[PDB]
PDB file of C-alpha atoms in Angstrom:
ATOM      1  CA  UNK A   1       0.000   0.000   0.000  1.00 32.38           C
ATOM      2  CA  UNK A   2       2.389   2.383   0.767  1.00 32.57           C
ATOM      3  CA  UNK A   3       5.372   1.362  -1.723  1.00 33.08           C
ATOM      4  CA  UNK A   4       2.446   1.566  -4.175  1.00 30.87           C
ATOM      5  CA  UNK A   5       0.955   5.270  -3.265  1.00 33.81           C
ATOM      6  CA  UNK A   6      -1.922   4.575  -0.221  1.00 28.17           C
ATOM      7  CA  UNK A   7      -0.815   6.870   2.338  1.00 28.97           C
ATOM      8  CA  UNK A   8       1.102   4.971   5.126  1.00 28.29           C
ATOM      9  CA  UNK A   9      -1.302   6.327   8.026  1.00 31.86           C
ATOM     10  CA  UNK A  10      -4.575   5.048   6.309  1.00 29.08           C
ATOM     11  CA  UNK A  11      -3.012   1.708   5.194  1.00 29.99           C
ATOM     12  CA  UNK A  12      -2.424   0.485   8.226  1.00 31.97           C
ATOM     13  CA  UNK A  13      -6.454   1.122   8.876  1.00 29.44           C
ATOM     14  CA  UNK A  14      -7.512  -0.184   5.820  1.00 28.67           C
ATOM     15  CA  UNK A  15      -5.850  -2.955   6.576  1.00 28.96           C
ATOM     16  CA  UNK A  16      -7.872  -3.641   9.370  1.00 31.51           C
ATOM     17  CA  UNK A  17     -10.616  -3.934   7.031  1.00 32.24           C
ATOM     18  CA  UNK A  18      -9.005  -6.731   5.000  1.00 33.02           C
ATOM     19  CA  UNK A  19      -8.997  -8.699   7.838  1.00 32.90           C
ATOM     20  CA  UNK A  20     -12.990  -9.506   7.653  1.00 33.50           C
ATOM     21  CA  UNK A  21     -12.701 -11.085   4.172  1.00 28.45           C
ATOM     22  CA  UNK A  22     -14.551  -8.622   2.477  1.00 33.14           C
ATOM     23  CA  UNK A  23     -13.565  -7.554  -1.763  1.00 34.39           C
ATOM     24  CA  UNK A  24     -12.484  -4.629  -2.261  1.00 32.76           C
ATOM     25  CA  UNK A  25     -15.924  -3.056  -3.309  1.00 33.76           C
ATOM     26  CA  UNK A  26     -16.531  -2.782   1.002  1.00 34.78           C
ATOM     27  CA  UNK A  27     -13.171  -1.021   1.007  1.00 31.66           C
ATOM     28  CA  UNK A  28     -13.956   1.852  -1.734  1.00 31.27           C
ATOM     29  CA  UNK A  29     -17.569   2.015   0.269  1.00 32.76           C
ATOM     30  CA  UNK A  30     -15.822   3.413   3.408  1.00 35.66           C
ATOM     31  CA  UNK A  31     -13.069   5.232   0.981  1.00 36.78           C
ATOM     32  CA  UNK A  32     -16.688   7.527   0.071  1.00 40.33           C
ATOM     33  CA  UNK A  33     -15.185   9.161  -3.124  1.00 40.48           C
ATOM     34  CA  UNK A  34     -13.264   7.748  -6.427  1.00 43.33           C
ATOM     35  CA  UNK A  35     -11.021   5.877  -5.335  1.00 42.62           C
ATOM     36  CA  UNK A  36     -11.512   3.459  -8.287  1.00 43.60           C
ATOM     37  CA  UNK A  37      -8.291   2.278  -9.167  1.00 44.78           C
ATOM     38  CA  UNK A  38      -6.390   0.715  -6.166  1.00 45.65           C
ATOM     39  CA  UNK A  39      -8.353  -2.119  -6.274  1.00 46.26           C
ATOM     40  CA  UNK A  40      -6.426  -3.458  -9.049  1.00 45.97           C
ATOM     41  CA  UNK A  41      -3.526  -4.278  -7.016  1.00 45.90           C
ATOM     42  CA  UNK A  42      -5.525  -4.554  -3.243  1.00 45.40           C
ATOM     43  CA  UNK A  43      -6.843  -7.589  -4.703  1.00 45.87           C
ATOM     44  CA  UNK A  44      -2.994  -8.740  -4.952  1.00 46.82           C
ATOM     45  CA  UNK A  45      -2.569  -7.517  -1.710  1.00 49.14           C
ATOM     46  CA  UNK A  46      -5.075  -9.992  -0.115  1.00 48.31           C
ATOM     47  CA  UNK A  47      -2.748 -13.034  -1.125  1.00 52.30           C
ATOM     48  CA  UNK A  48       0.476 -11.139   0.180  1.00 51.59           C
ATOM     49  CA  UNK A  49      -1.048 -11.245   3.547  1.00 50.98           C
ATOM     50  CA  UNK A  50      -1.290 -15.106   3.640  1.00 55.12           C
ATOM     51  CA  UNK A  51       1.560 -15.657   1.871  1.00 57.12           C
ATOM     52  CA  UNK A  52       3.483 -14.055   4.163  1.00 54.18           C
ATOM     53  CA  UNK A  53       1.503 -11.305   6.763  1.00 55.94           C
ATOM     54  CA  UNK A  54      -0.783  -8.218   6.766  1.00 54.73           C
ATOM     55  CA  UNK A  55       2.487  -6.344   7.976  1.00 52.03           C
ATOM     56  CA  UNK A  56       4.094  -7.137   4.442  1.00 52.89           C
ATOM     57  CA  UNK A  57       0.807  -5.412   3.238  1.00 53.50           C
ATOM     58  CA  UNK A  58       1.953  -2.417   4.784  1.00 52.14           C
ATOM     59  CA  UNK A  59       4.390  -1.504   2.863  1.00 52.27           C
ATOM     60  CA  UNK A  60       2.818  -2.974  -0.373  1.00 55.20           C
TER      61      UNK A  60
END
């Protein structure tokens, strides 16, 4: 997230929010504005967390 632009504060919090499982259409639904775009690669991001943690998502 934040090697890729997502602004390191938010990222961890968003985060948070991958956590419950949910595709990236709940994440844009709390984003409230168009943030269309990201979810290209935070669908990527879902499998770097169980490949090898959600603190590796961090800096994605």
């Amino acid at each position: 997230l934040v090697a890729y632009g997502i602004a390191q504060g938010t990222a961890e919090k968003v985060v948070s929010l991958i956590n419950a499982g949910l595709t990236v259409g709940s994440i844009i639904s709390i984003l409230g504005g168009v943030t269309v775009g990201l979810s290209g690669v935070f669908t990527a991001v879902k499998a770097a967390i169980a490949k090898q943690g959600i603190k590796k998502a961090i800096q994605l």
